Design a protein around this ligand. Structure first.
Ligand SMILES: N[C@@H](CCCC[B-](O)(O)O)C(=O)O
Ligand SMILES: N[C@@H](CCCC[B-](O)(O)O)C(=O)O
Ligand SMILES: N[C@@H](CCCC[B-](O)(O)O)C(=O)O
Ligand SMILES: [Zn+2]
Ligand SMILES: [Zn+2]
Ligand SMILES: [Zn+2]
Ligand SMILES: [Zn+2]
Ligand SMILES: [Zn+2]
Ligand SMILES: [Zn+2]
Ligand SMILES: [Zn+2]
Ligand SMILES: [Zn+2]
Ligand SMILES: [Zn+2]
Ligand SMILES: [Zn+2]
Ligand SMILES: [Zn+2]
Ligand SMILES: [Zn+2]
Ligand SMILES: [Zn+2]
Ligand SMILES: [Zn+2]
Ligand SMILES: [Zn+2]
Lengths: 313, 313, 313
C-alpha cells in the first residue's frame, strides 16, 4: 500500500546552531509514527542513525566540518538506499539540510530517474567557492548537480559523492533569500524555480500544477521532496535556524504536500531544519513541530476534505 | 428595502462548553443593531428566545441533551418562520450550531426552494449513528437532508423535524476537519463542497463564483447562509469551541459575505459558535466578536470599496 | 543607472498624532541609504527639509493647520522638482500623507504626463467640504485632480496649487476604509481602483497586471508611487496613525513594488505614515520600519528570487 521507512538523522554540523540534532526526538515524541499508522500507512522505523564524532575536522578553506558532514551523508545515503530496496518511501527526520546530500544520493542509487522538489526559502546551492558562510546546510544541491561536476573541489569526506541529478530534474518552491552566486547558477543552468514572487503572481494552485507538469511531463518517475521547515513563514515554523519573513502559508504548505501525495509517486521525503531550542517560547516550539508533523501526514494521505476507509458507514 | 429581523438564540446544550449562550449578548453589546441601522437596513429585533430548562434529558445512546436541543430548534424554527412572513431576512445570533436545524427548518416553511451555503471548518453532518462525540452541534445537517431521511433514528425531541433539503441544494466552504463517516456521506450523496484545499487551489474568487453558479444556476431561489465562526482561522475568531488551524482568512471571510449580499437573495443568516468565555485574553474575545460583527455587516451591504447613499455630495 | 535622490520630510500637521515627523529619522537609522547603495543604485541624499513653524494657523472651517500643510507641500514640490531635474528618482521619506500634494505637484512640474499608483487603505480624496475630520492627510488627492478644480475652495496656504492630474491617470490599490463622499467621487469621475475586494477576487498578480495595463496602455509615461504604510495589514505595519484590518499582505506589498520596479519607469516614490511612537511595543516599531524599508528596496531592484551583478561567479 503506502509503505514508509523512517530514518531519524540527529545531525547538526551542517551549520552553527546545534539544537537541530533533537529534531528527530521531538517529532517522534509528537506522535508521528502513531499518527501515520492511523492512516492506510505501513510504517517501519529504522531508528536514529548514530553519528560518530569526528574530533579532527578542521576547516577546508572556509567550509566548516567537512569530514563530519560528508560521513553523515555517506552513512545516510546507504541507509536510504536500504529502505528503498525494502520497497518503502524513505522518510528522513533530520537536523540541518546538509543531510539532503546523503538522502538524495542513496535514493538515486535505487531510482536514478528521480525528480526533486525543493521547498525552501533558500536554494542551498552555494559551492565551497561561492559560499561566504562556509556552512554546508546551504550547499547540498551543488554537490548533487551533474552540470556543476567539475567546478567543485574535492572536499574532505565527500570523495564518496557522485552527482546524481541534472538541472532539468529539480524544482524549487518558496525562495526569498537567495545569494548572488546562487542566483547566477540558477539563470545559467536554467533551473526551474518558483520564488515567492511567482507564488504571489500565480497562486499555489498554478504553481503546483506547473511544477508537476514540469517534472512528470515526460515519464512518470519517482518523486523526492526535500522540505526545509524554513520554507514556511516564521509565524508557522519559528523554531528554525535560518528563518526569512514573507514565507509560505500554512495552507500553502499543506497544499504542496497534499498535491505531491495525490500523484502517487512520492518516493523520498526530508523534513529538515526543525530546531526546538530556537523557539523563543515553549509554544513556538510546539507550533513549529506541529506544523512539521501536519505537513508530513499530508504527504502520506491526510486530506483536509477528509478521508474514508473502504466501507459503508 | 433591506429589511432584517433579529433572532437572539442563547443556547449551548448542542455541545459541552457553555459560554456560547452569551453570544447574543456580546454581539448586541458590540453595537450590531446600531451599526446595521447605520446602513440602508430596516432593523427589527425580536428578542432573545427564552429556552426552558429540560432537567430530564438523559443521553439517547451517545447523543447528549436531545430533548433540550430538539425543543430549542423547534421553538426557533417557529420564530424564524414568523419573521420570514413579516418579510424580513432572519438574522440568528446564536450559540452552538445545532440551532441550524431550527433556523433552516422554519426558513424553509416559508421558502421551501431555498439553497444553503454552509461556512464551517466542519460539515456538521454526523448522524446519531456516525457521531463519536454525541454533541449535536456536529449533526444539524444530517437532520435536514431528505436523502438521509430513513437512516436517522427518532431522537427524543426531534419528532417535529421534517427534512427540508436535498443534497443538491447545499454548498460547504472552509472544510478542514472532517470525520470519516462525514466524508463517506459527502462523496455518496455527491454534496458540493470547497474544502481549504479547493480554496487554496482556486482562490476565494473562483470559489464564490462556482458556489453561486451552483446554487443559482437554474432558478433564482432565496439564500440561507449558516456561518460557523470557526470557519475562519483561529487567529481571527479564537473565542470558539472547536477551532482548527489553516482556516479562512479575514479578507476571504468578508469576500464570501460581500458576494452573498450582492446577489440580493440573502433570505436567512446564522452567526454561530461565538463563545466569549473561550478567549484566552480580553482581546481575543474582542477580536472574535469584532470579526463576527464585521462579517454580518458585509452580509447587509457594507462594502470595503465604500458605500454611498442616493445623493450628490 | 538607477539613480535616486532622497528627500526626508519630517512633517505631521496633516493629522492629529505627531510621531510621524520622526519617520525620516528612524528609516535612515535603519540603514536605508546604505542598503540602497548596496544595490546598483546611485544614491544622493538631499537632507531633511526644515519645516518652519507656523504659530498662527487657525482652522479654515474644519480644515486644520492649512497654512502649515500648504507651505510644507509648497516647499517639498520645489525640492522634488529639483532632484527630478538632477535626473534622479525622487524618494520621499515622510510623515503624514498630506505631503503627497507637494510630492506629486513638483514631480509633475518636470514630468507632466506622469501616472499615479496610490497604495492605501484610504483614498485620501476628501475635500474641505466633504471631510468630516478636517485632517489634511485624508484630502491630498482632491487638490491634485483637475476634474475637481472648481469645487474646492481656496484654502490658506494652497494658492500655489495647480491640479496636475486627471481621473484617468491614477490607480488605487488596497482600499478598505472609504468615506461616502469619497465613494461618490470615485464612481462619478470613474477613477480606477482595486479595493481589497478586487484583490481578494483577482489576486495581486492580475491586479498588478491590470493596473499597469491601465496606466501604460497608451504611452509609456513616468510612474509615481504613493505608498501609505497603512495600506498593508496592521500585523505588518502597526506603528501607523490610521490602521485598518484586512489589509495587504507583506508578500503582496513586495509583489506590488517588485512589479513597479520591473517596469523601469518608477519616477517618484513616497513612503508615508510611518509613526514609530504609535507602536505598542519596541518590536511593532521595528517590524513597521523594517517592512517600510523592505518595500522601498524592492522598488529599487531587490528581488526575492535573487539578484546578480554582471559577472561570472
Ligand atoms: N544562503 C545562506 C543560508 C543558507 C541556509 C541553508 B538552509 O536552507 O538549509 O537553511 C548560506 O549559504 O549560508
Ligand atoms: N466533527 C466533530 C466536531 C463538530 C463541530 C461542530 B461545529 O461545527 O458546530 O463546531 C464532532 O462531530 O463532534
Ligand atoms: N477618511 C479619513 C481617514 C483618512 C486617512 C488619511 B491617510 O490615508 O493618510 O492615512 C479622513 O478623512 O479623516
Ligand atoms: Zn526508478
Ligand atoms: Zn532554507
Ligand atoms: Zn539550514
Ligand atoms: Zn546573468
Ligand atoms: Zn535548506
Ligand atoms: Zn421562496
Ligand atoms: Zn465548525
Ligand atoms: Zn460547534
Ligand atoms: Zn468511497
Ligand atoms: Zn458548525
Ligand atoms: Zn515626462
Ligand atoms: Zn491610509
Ligand atoms: Zn495618514
Ligand atoms: Zn451613485
Ligand atoms: Zn494615505
Amino acid at each position: 500500500s503506502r509503505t514508509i521507512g523512517i530514518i531519524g538523522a540527529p545531525f547538526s554540523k551542517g551549520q552553527p546552531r546545534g539544537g537541530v540534532e533533537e529534531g528527530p526526538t521531538v517529532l517522534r515524541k509528537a506522535g508521528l509514527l502513531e499518527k501515520l499508522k492511523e492512516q492506510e500507512c505501513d510504517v517501519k522505523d529504522y531508528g536514529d542513525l548514530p553519528f560518530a564524532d569526528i574530533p579532527n575536522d578542521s576547516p577546508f578553506q572556509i567550509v566548516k566540518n567537512p569530514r563530519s558532514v560528508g560521513k553523515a551523508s555517506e552513512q545516510l545515503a546507504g541507509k536510504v538506499a536500504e529502505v528503498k530496496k525494502n520497497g518503502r518511501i524513505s522518510l528522513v527526520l533530520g537536523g540541518d539540510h546538509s543531510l539532503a546530500i546523503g538522502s538524495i544520493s542513496g535514493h538515486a542509487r535505487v531510482h536514478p530517474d528521480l525528480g526533486v522538489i525543493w521547498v525552501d526559502a533558500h536554494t542551498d546551492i552555494n559551492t565551497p567557492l561561492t559560499t561566504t558562510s562556509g556552512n554546508l546546510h546551504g550547499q547540498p544541491v551543488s554537490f548533487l548537480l551533474k552540470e556543476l561536476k567539475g567546478k567543485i573541489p574535492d572536499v574532505p569526506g565527500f570523495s564518496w559523492v557522485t552527482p546524481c541529478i541534472s538541472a532539468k530534474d529539480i524544482v524549487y518552491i518558496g525562495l526569498r533569500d537567495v545569494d548572488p552566486g546562487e542566483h547566477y547558477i540558477l539563470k545559467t543552468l536554467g533551473i526551474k524555480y518558483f520564488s515567492m514572487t511567482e507564488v504571489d503572481r500565480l497562486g499555489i494552485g498554478k504553481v503546483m500544477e506547473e511544477t508537476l507538469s514540469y517534472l512528470l511531463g515526460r515519464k512518470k518517475r519517482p518523486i523526492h521532496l526535500s522540505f526545509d521547515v524554513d520554507g514556511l513563514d516564521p509565524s508557522f515554523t519559528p523554531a528554525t535556524g535560518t528563518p526569512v519573513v514573507g514565507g509560505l502559508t500554512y495552507r500553502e504548505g499543506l497544499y504542496i504536500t497534499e498535491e505531491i501525495y495525490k500523484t502517487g509517486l512520492l518516493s523520498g521525503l526530508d523534513i529538515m531544519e526543525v530546531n526546538p531550542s530556537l523557539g523563543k517560547t515553549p509554544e513556538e516550539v510546539t507550533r513549529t513541530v506541529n506544523t512539521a508533523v501536519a505537513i508530513t501526514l499530508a504527504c502520506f494521505g491526510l486530506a483536509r476534505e477528509g478521508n474514508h476507509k473502504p466501507i459503508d458507514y
